[PDB]
Every structure is written in C-alpha cells, then in structure tokens.
Design a protein around this ligand. Structure first.
Ligand SMILES: C[C@@H]1O[C@@H](CC(=O)O)[C@@H](O)[C@H](O)[C@@H]1O
Ligand SMILES: C[C@@H]1O[C@@H](CC(=O)O)[C@@H](O)[C@H](O)[C@@H]1O
Ligand SMILES: C[C@@H]1O[C@@H](CC(=O)O)[C@@H](O)[C@H](O)[C@@H]1O
Ligand SMILES: *C(=O)C[C@@H]1O[C@@H](C)[C@@H](O)[C@@H](O)[C@@H]1O
Ligand SMILES: *Cc1cccc(C*)c1
Ligand SMILES: [Ca+2]
Ligand SMILES: [Ca+2]
Ligand SMILES: [Ca+2]
Ligand SMILES: [Ca+2]
Ligand SMILES: [Ca+2]
Ligand SMILES: [Ca+2]
Ligand SMILES: [Ca+2]
Ligand SMILES: [Ca+2]
Lengths: 11, 114, 114, 114, 114
C-alpha cells in the first residue's frame, strides 16, 4: 500500500 | 509460466497453511479440481497464520492457489520440493505491490499427512 | 549429512512453524546461536500447527531445528529453496518410527517477513 | 515474477551447463553483472549438453540466464535449492512454444566448485 | 534418511549427468529397478562433466544414484524440485572426505525430455 501512511494503514 | 498449480496424488489428504506479511488484507483461495475448497482472509505484517486446513485432493489431484488483495490478483511464485522421496512441499509466494518481496501471502501445502 | 541446520542472513527475523503427523507427541526445539529460542510440543495425526513463532537469526545467522519424541531424537531431512531470488523457505521433515513418511514433525522456516 | 536471475556469493567460481529438448535451435546467454559471459547453442530433442563452462560471479554476484529461439525470447521458470546448507543449485527451465514442457532449454548452475 | 533414490513416472526417459570436484576419481552408478544402467568415472577439480546419458525409468520408475571413490561409498544428499508443475530435477551431491562441500560428485537427473 503506502507504508504506514502516518497512522491509518491501508485505507 | 503458470504458478500456484500443483498435481498431487489423487484422493490424498493434504495440509494448506497461509501466512501474511503485508499492510493489505490477503484473500487466499484454494481450488481442488477447479472448485473452491477453502478460503482464508486476514492481515498481518508479522507472518501471522491467517488460515490452516486439511483438504482432500480428490479424483483429479489438481490443487490451485490464488491470492488477491481487495480484488487485485497477486502475482504468484511457486515450486514443489520432495525430501527423501517421500515428503512433499508445494510452496507459494505472492506479491501485492511493487517492492518484490513476494511474502505478502505465503502458502505452504504439505503431504502426506497422518 | 547434517540436516536441519540453516545459515540465514544475520540479524534477520524469520517465521518458524511446526506441524505434527504421528501418534507420538512431538517436541520441536528451534535453536538460534546454539541456544533454544522456541519450543513446541503436541500430538496430532491431522497436521495440527503445534506452534508458530517469529525469531531473530542473531549475529551468526545459524538456525537449527531438532525434533524428539519423549527424549528420543528423530531422524531429520531438510533443504532450502529460494523463489524469484527473494523468498526463502527452509524445510524440515522428521521420522520417529519405521514407516519412513518423514512427516511426524514437519517444520517450515520462512523469510523475509514484513 | 522475474525468473532466471540469481544472487550468488560474490567472487565465486560456479558451473553453468545447458541442455536442449526442442526441435528449435536454442541460444542460452549467461550474464554476469549484466554483461554476457557465456553463450551456448544447439538443437536436440534428447537432452544434449550444448554447453558447460566455469565462470566467476564477480564483485556483484549477479548471474542471469536468458534463452531465445531464432531471436524470440523463451518464457523462463527458475528456483534455487540448497542441500545440507552447503551445496547450491540454480535451476532454469524455458518454453519456446505451446506445449509447456519447459524443458526446451534447461540450465543448471552449481557451486561451490573444487 | 535414505538419499539418492527417486520415484520417476514409470517408463519415462530421463537425462542423467555427472560433474566432479575432487582430487579423487569419482565412480557414479545409476540403478534402474535395482540394476545398474549407467556408470560414469572421472576426475576433476573444475566441475568437468564425467558422464551424461539418457535412461528409461522402467516399470517401477525407481532410480538410484550411488557414488564411490577408491572403493568407498560417498555420503549423499539429495532432493527433487518441480518447476511450473512440469519440469523435474532430481539432484544429488556427495562427499568423499572431511571438508563437507558435498560437490565431489554432483549428479543431475532431469525429465521430461523431448
Ligand atoms: C500414526 C503413526 O504414528 C507413528 C508411529 C507410531 O505409531 C508415525 O511414525 C507414523 O508415521 C504414523 O504417523
Ligand atoms: C519437439 C518439440 O519442439 C518444440 C516446438 C516446435 O515444434 C518444443 O516446444 C516442444 O516442447 C518439443 O520439444
Ligand atoms: C581437492 C579436494 O579433494 C577431496 C578430498 C581429497 O583431498 C574433496 O573431498 C575435497 O572437497 C576437495 O575437492
Ligand atoms: C503497501 O504498503 C505494500 C505492502 O505492505 C508493506 C507493509 C510490505 O509488506 C509490502 O511488501 C507489501 O507489498
Ligand atoms: C494503500 C492504499 C490503498 C487505497 C487507499 C489508500 C489511502 C491507501
Ligand atoms: Ca510485497
Ligand atoms: Ca511484504
Ligand atoms: Ca513416521
Ligand atoms: Ca507420520
Ligand atoms: Ca516446449
Ligand atoms: Ca521440449
Ligand atoms: Ca568434499
Ligand atoms: Ca570437493
């Protein structure tokens, strides 16, 4: 996906 | 080349176990003779077992593993290994993105059981 | 030859998973740096996952699998397979008796994780 | 997935050997660090050893096998197997047509030597 | 465990090829249905092909590889690997001494041919 996305994972 | 397709001995019990290493939820479908026999789903970045089950290879012995993430088919890699001419492993890795670690779902098929 | 000994990349997390297929209780010991780092025990003739864990291969990368039944060491077979030059399996089978199915404890090591 | 690419230990002598099983003339190219280091060719339906050579994996350890028939790249399958944690095989199959026997050129890489 | 024994499909032609990496002269015997069907002999420390032949696995499919040096059997390691559910390798390494490189004679069996 996009890594950790700064605290909101995969969607 | 086709990957994730294995010819087992017919009418043989086998184990199938799936691990997850991805931020995406993995969906693992196991087909026997082209019909869905098991489906696993789960999410882990720490190799958690998201499914394990004993199945029968049936009259055809044809077993196929498919992996998808939210409807996107994952690219598969696979091989079969036989130790001391008796112990069989059918191994599958899969990739849901572009980092090419091929561990996003890992599927291990083993036989004989018992 | 020696079996059940694997050189992993140093300081690398890996999964280790044990299956049982025997009337005897299996004891699976996983050694890192020559010290037991995980132990699983159980009896199953139906491929139960008697244990799965994530371990660190440590500074030497040396991982060893040992199997015994009530203190009696089982005979081991093993190999390592690498798919698409990135996905590693270290595979172990073991025999506690006379029928040579070598599935009495089956151990699968996989890396990388995550 | 990418096939026919292997990371060997750097600066290591290895054997590479090619077999042919096809009505088409096979051309096998072995690249080390992305530069051609050996080329084999032949035509046999009976497993002729169309070439064998000792090479050095060089500073990168990168070895790649490519197969073509009359200028058309064949589809590749590959894996690496390690026995008793010491003996290494890198294996390649290739398909030039429609029957998917994947033996049209077969390449075996082995190390260590000596 | 028993090593160097493989169950091939019955009455199937297969290739067998042997390489040497030892100061000692290697003798490789290939048995089909418990009778010697091919014998290779040679000495190399540079992975020379000491023999290659096409054999028929016969009614039982049982193929056995034996290696000896100076009249003493070597210790064997072996496994079978299957790529894309079609391409088979039966792999043998052997050790005639104490350094445990298990390459002293290396034997590759491959099928299908043609
Ligand atoms: C049920 C049996 O239990 C053992 C021996 C005793 O009995 C195993 O070695 C066999 O492979 C089989 O699983
Ligand atoms: C003899 C045949 O030659 C090829 C096709 C043309 O014909 C190969 O792909 C087949 O596997 C087979 O070896
Ligand atoms: C040159 C050496 O010859 C043997 C023994 C004598 O010496 C082999 O076992 C070694 O692996 C090495 O190839
Ligand atoms: C999305 O982030 C990519 C995805 O999840 C990562 C945590 C990592 O496991 C990667 O391999 C996977 O494809
Ligand atoms: C990985 C990812 C998929 C879809 C949406 C988002 C925000 C992230
Ligand atoms: Ca990935
Ligand atoms: Ca991953
Ligand atoms: Ca047993
Ligand atoms: Ca058993
Ligand atoms: Ca073909
Ligand atoms: Ca062919
Ligand atoms: Ca040796
Ligand atoms: Ca040697």
């Amino acid at each position: 996906x996009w890594x950790k996305x700064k605290x909101k994972x995969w969607x | 080349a086709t990957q994730g397709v294995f010819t087992l001995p017919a009418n043989t019990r086998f184990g199938v176990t799936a691990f997850a290493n991805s931020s995406g939820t993995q969906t693992v479908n196991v087909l026997v003779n082209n019909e869905t026999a098991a489906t696993f789903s789960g999410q882990s970045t720490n190799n958690a077992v998201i499914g394990t089950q004993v199945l029968n290879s049936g009259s055809s012995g044809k077993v196929q593993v498919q992996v998808s993430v939210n409807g996107r088919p994952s690219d598969l890699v696979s091989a079969q290994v036989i130790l001391t001419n008796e112990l069989n492993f059918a191994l599958v890795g899969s990739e849901d993105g572009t980092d090419n670690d091929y561990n996003d779902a890992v599927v291990v098929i083993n036989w004989p059981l018992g």
